[PDB]
Design a protein around this nucleic acid. Sequence first.
RNA 1: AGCCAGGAUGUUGGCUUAGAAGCAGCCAUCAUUUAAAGAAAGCGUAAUAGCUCACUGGUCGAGUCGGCCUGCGCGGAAGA
Lengths: 422, 70, 176, 141, 38, 131
Amino acid sequence: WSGMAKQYEPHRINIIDTPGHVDFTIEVERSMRVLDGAVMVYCAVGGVQPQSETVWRQANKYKVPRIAFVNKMDRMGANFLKVVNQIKTRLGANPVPLQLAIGAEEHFTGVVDLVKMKAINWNDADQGVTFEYEDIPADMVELANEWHQNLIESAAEASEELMEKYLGGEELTEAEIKGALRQRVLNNEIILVTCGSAFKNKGVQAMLDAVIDYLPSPVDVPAINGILDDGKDTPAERHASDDEPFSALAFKIATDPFVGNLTFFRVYSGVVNSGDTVLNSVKAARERFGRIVQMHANKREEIKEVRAGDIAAAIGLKDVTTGDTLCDPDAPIILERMEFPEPVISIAVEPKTKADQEKMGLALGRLAKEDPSFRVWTDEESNQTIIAGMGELHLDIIVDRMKREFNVEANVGKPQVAYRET
Amino acid sequence: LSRRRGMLKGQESEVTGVKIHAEVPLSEMFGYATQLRSLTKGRASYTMEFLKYDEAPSNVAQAVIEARGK
Amino acid sequence: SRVAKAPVVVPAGVDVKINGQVITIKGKNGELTRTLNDAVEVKHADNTLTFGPRDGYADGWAQAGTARALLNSMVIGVTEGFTKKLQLVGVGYRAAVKGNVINLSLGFSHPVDHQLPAGITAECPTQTEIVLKGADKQVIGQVAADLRAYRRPEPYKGKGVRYADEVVRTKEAKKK
Amino acid sequence: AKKVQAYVKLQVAAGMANPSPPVGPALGQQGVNIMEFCKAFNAKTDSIEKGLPIPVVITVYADRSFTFVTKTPPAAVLLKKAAGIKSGSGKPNKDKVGKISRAQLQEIAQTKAADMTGADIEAMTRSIEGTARSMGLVVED
Amino acid sequence: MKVRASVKKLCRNCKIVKRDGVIRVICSAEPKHKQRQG
Amino acid sequence: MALNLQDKQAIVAEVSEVAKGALSAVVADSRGVTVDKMTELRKAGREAGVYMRVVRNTLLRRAVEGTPFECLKDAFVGPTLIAYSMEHPGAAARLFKEFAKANAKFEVKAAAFEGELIPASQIDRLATLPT
RNA sequence: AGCCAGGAUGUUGGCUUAGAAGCAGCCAUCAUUUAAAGAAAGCGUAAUAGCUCACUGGUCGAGUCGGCCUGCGCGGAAGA
Ligand SMILES: Nc1nc2c(ncn2[C@@H]2O[C@H](COP(=O)(O)OP(=O)(O)O)[C@@H](O)[C@H]2O)c(=O)[nH]1
């Protein structure tokens, strides 16, 4: 990225999309830690919802600095400010609206910046490449300026003298504004809210410059601390700069037939290069490093080099799994992450064909490694395995994963409860 | 919960909702979360932990005696 | 019946025409005519209007009271007129009025357009609320209930046409 | 005058009067803060006793002000630890409300007649007398 | 509604009416108390 | 639950003290709380005595049956709701004016505290007595 | 009948010292206060709530309130 024609240096923003169901919520737990900033998506009409709040808590756990987008301004009943208030009062946040909505469902055309006090008015879904900025649409600037005042109200409290300077009757510049807000936004202070409809392609183009402009960079965000057998205070500061021994963090494991294993990882510190050696410092294992495939407009980008903060996926080695550290033999063995949600709904399971319980057991082995938020059980009553999952759907999209992945049909059932007698 | 089996033992205020203690049987909690999501619009959770054992007249255990025979 | 024992004291400016049994009553709004139950004897009697159960009619007292109520409302219609107030609960449920036809976007598939009866003046102080005005109470109430029945209030979130004073008794969708 | 937002006629053991997550799922929905929740209600209770629920008002202000005049716990309510018997109503006819004496009950009704006032203190005497015998057993003196 | 052969008032809000020679029950409070005949 | 016999009995019992007494007060309370009628009765009893029941008795023949014992020109209290209170400490005492002083503060209405034509007093403060 | 208020201060009655908080844990409770507070019979029930027990209070002023026996009716009551 670089900007909306207003652009400054292409930045490799590294992006991991997020799902919206708490059932597979480890995907939010790890991928909140792996994350530097956070885009709190929102329905401009739906507002905040049982998962907006759920993932908000998820985010709160990693204290991630989050700004919010309000998509779907074209659908009827969508209003940016309302959703803003929804967040502010359902989540207890300080939603500085660094933007504003020009229209609602029928007359949504642009976004009022409260600092440019201008409204870039793109074109629609494909053509929303028109970057014809427009100055102060008075219809909106009747109070867009006073919504800029809210923003200024948040930046003044950013520093001791900055508030006083704001009380000096003086305004703030295009850098002191962001840097004051950012310097703590990096530290998760207030959520900047911009409206748009990525379907209708407005708002999104700005919703990439405020990313660069406020979201912490791995250099703006505080340094992460590793862990060892004994977890120190800073057992190994693994700052962004890959000066540390290669020390990534592997968070996901994937599949490919022509590439084999497709493990994912965000490198916290250090640099591994197309064939190296690292240990499962968390598993006390070891192996080489062959064919990195960093994903950008994915063409099987079999990159021979992955560096600080550069999320990529590795092939081969042996074991890394979802929160397991990626470390050089120097091994800041552990990263604090040894957690994933516990199945809140367990259930017994057995194949359709009775001699497939061994294959459904192994399916559960694979599908248990594939996401950490899905346990497998094997009680001793008869034989039945208990697929302890997060949600009904969380472990029901794996009962069908055996049907899809492992071409086995299964009929689930309640676990047999241990009925002891006396 | 009263409908389920849960015997109320206290409930308070927690933060935004309330934390609610009840030593509900384990049998009575096998999809609870799912039911809970539906009841609360997906906005509540429960944490259950086997504690002890007790009885409820259910010759359902007498039923499962008829296995590989009667 | 007990009501029948109370004269309909005509207001100032109302023109009553006690023609046999059937009677017309003029007022500031208009003229209303009503066919009395044959069991009713009604007179003006100096700005009043009194009802007495005809002889030969055991059910005269109550019928005379029905006449007392029918003629009292008529007076009030011709002088004041009766005004019913309705609401549209439900998103996108809107009931704009175009002269005597209400273009309802109640979100079925189709625009519901209710052509008002002669005598009924519909107003919408809002996209989503009606104010019927008319001379006759029964018929304006009839119109209100007719309208309300198109997209009736509903028992969960009240969505649907409701009277402005309507107390929609709702309930929860389910526990589930 | 603020409306109904923290309405609970409940006073927990007043070592700290009405703890927040101690009460139950009716007082959870009450915005009243804790900074002055037990500042003037943990110390100024010494007018009756410290450790017993202070029958108090639930009047706070919309301006985050909190003003109320706490009345006192009844002598019978104190008659769980103060009048001997920990039991009381429900079976004062099938049980005793305790070895309650009116030589103390009257003295307590006269000296604790501050919160529940009236035209005559004899009125409060009879008030407490009905309060105690509402169980079916009251100090018999 | 119920068309029980025995309509009764189940509520302070239930009411007996004879629209057209038919004995119905109308509970203002319970629409379960809505009965038709008898 | 005022029967005709019991009605004339309670009316007469509450009317004799006012008939042979001094100037007292009554209220006009068709809209008041239990607390208002409890605390006002307690206040009236501390001022004068705990004998006054805060119940209202403005029926169409309570005073037209009790009041006509003496000074019958003082029978103009057949009006709406009335729950009265006595004032033994002097006719038209402080208590005889505190009600009208409190008529707009923590109370609905007080029937203006009409007084009584025991001596046929006119519109003035019935305290023409030097000290 | 209608219409205009009201159904306490112990009052979460201790009331199975979690409250079943004026109306499920359970009993008796006006005890100034009273017409009110029942200290419970649907609303929360965990309270609240506003109606609920009621009661007065007011309004205006003619019958009204209930039951018993009763007569005749009504329904109950669908086949080819
Ligand atoms: N009117 C409007 N429709 C949208 C918007 N965003 C998505 N949609 C549509 O809603 C559907 C889902 O959108 P999308 O974000 O791709 O699906 P997701 O996987 O649930 O997040 C699609 O059919 C979109 O066309 C928007 O901002 N405005």
